[PDB]
Design a binder for this molecule. Structure first.
Ligand code: O3B
Ligand code: ZN
Length: 257
């Protein structure tokens, strides 16, 4: 099946997932000189005060930190969004080197990694229903650059040794996602898709302008993960990012003038 190698990577996906060539695919390059300030954007509200993480899982493409989404405990509201979106998981995309790894790019600049906080619209009852709708998902994207260490990431970093290979999971309770946010919540927003198969066009993308800084040692531990399962030839989990897709007729709006 699909992956990120030379023979199953992003350029192959359209053979099994024809929507890969659709009209609102993600990620995209963010042209900062063409994104327009939108005064019609309400303030963005990240309410992670009562977030309840459960588990961390290596799914052979990335690792997911999974949250209890049975109640409105961690929710995203406001900005371009109508209603309440519940946090279900977060994960990262990263590169083999610090000059690549992010999915979105900013004036063609690639960051070392990108964090995706994935939320689903409560009006559709559950995640599986939401991804079938144009406004089903909201994904908050946060760029990572290599610099000083991110203390709020270290709990994630420390547990990766226990989920090295595909299918491994570990208990991951009392993790506070607020420690992964930058100082400012200025953002760009546009309508797009999941960036991995099934590539469904169901995402309101909210991409923060300000990156967070992580240490070289921290990203180094990301790169020690494996795509493969236990007891198999080792493939380091690196470069698990999809490149920028054509913007087509979409407009990127900026929350900041
Ligand atoms: N990388 S992303 O946030 O756009 C994403 C999130 C979820 C799924 B999925 O549930 O298959 C795929 C891609
Ligand atoms: Zn992602």
């Amino acid at each position: 099946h699909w992956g990120y190698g030379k023979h199953n990577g992003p350029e192959h996906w359209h053979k099994d997932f024809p929507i890969a060539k659709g009209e609102r695919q993600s990620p995209v390059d963010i042209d900062t000189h063409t994104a327009k300030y939108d005064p019609s954007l309400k303030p963005l509200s990240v309410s992670y005060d009562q977030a309840t993480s459960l588990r961390i899982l290596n799914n052979g493409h990335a690792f997911n930190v999974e949250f209890d989404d049975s109640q409105d405990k961690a929710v995203l509201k406001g900005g371009p969004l109508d209603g309440t979106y519940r946090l279900i998981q977060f994960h990262f995309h990263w590169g083999s080197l610090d000059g690549q790894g992010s999915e979105h790019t900013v004036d063609k600049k690639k960051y070392a990694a990108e964090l995706h906080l994935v939320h689903w619209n409560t009006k559709y009852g559950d995640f599986g229903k939401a991804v079938q709708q144009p406004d089903g998902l909201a994904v908050l994207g946060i760029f990572l650059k290599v610099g000083s260490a991110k203390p709020g990431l270290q709990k994630v970093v420390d547990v990766l040794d226990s989920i090295k290979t595909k299918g491994k999971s570990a208990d991951f309770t009392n993790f506070d996602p607020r420690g992964l946010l930058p100082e400012s919540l200025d953002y760009w927003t546009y309508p797009g898709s999941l960036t991995t198969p099934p590539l469904l066009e169901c995402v309101t993308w909210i991409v923060l302008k300000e990156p967070i800084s992580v240490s070289s040692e921290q990203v180094l531990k990301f790169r020690k993960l494996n795509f493969n399962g236990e007891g198999e030839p080792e493939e380091l989990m690196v470069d698990n990012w999809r490149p920028a897709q054509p913007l087509k007729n979409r407009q990127i709006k900026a929350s900041f003038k």
